[PDB]
Design a protein around this ligand. Structure first.
Ligand SMILES: C[C@@H](CO)C[C@H](N)C(=O)O
Ligand SMILES: [Mn+2]
Length: 262
């Protein structure tokens, strides 16, 4: 148990918490090399920007690169995730949102949970998102922005857009917050953005409202997000389940491991 009482309180009240410097520069380098290799793999798990010039998102890199499997079992991620949820955990979703320098596109304002509830039959928000900065995150390269404390409202109901932006995953556009909702909410739940060097870890709640702007800077923003889910909270889909690359199916409890990534 590494999170302090203050850190757990911040997660409960504000919906997110930043752990700076969890991984060393050398460990970041190993992960970036594995990302460069994984970005070249062909398949439906690889989502391009709308302009087709770069990758926008990669799914399930932990099934293809050893270091990302190691990362997902590291006690530096699972320790904190287990403190917050107090249960056995497994990977519901593993993604890297690779927002390129010089025009990497935005991510619409949204909550995560309603998407998984309505698309995948996820019963409850008994999950936690764990971000790992593979780039330095600054005000300039399209950081995740949270509406602080906005998870306390619970789920803000909406229907999925008639047509989907992508047939490879659910882009948050499909379930985006309306301008009216965001305008009402922001007075009590102000915009905040964790900013820190690569190797930092960011935990955030599946019902916090979050989004991010285009990256006009000369610096990329590669953000890895592992969504850990309570093994007792496995999805119960209505129709055919979505692919395993986007929605995890192996509910074996993960056992944390210590030591450096390689
Ligand atoms: C809302 C979004 C996660 O930030 C959903 C994810 N793209 C999925 O396809 O499950
Ligand atoms: Mn999200």
């Amino acid at each position: 148990m590494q999170l302090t009482a203050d850190q757990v309180e911040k997660y409960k009240s504000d919906g997110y918490v930043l752990l700076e410097g969890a991984f060393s520069p050398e460990e970041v380098h190993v992960m970036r090399q594995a990302l460069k290799k994984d970005q070249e793999v062909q398949g439906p798990h690889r989502i391009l920007e709308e302009d087709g010039r770069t990758v926008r998102a990669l799914y399930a890199s932990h099934t293809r690169q050893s270091v990302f499997d190691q990362l997902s079992r590291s006690d530096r991620l699972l320790g904190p995730a287990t403190q917050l949820l107090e249960c056995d955990l497994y990977i519901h979703q593993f993604k890297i949102n690779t927002k390129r320098a010089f025009g990497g596109d935005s991510w619409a304002w949204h909550q995560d949970f309603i998407v998984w509830r309505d698309t995948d039959g996820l019963p409850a928000p008994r999950a936690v998102n764990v971000g790992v900065f593979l780039s330095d995150v600054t005000e300039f390269n399209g950081p995740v922005v949270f509406l602080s404390g906005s998870h306390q409202r619970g789920t803000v109901e909406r229907k999925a857009r008639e047509t989907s932006r992508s047939d490879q995953h659910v882009d948050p556009d499909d379930y985006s917050m309306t301008p009216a909702e965001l305008s009402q909410m922001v007075e009590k739940h102000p915009m905040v953005s964790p900013k820190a060097a690569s190797g930092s870890v960011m935990l955030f709640h599946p019902e916090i409202i979050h989004g991010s702007a285009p990256n006009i800077s000369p610096f990329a923003r590669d953000l890895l997000i592992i969504t850990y889910n309570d093994v007792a909270n496995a999805p119960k889909p209505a129709g055919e389940p979505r692919p395993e690359y986007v929605i995890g199916r192996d509910t074996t409890p993960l056992v944390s491991r210590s030591g450096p990534l390689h």
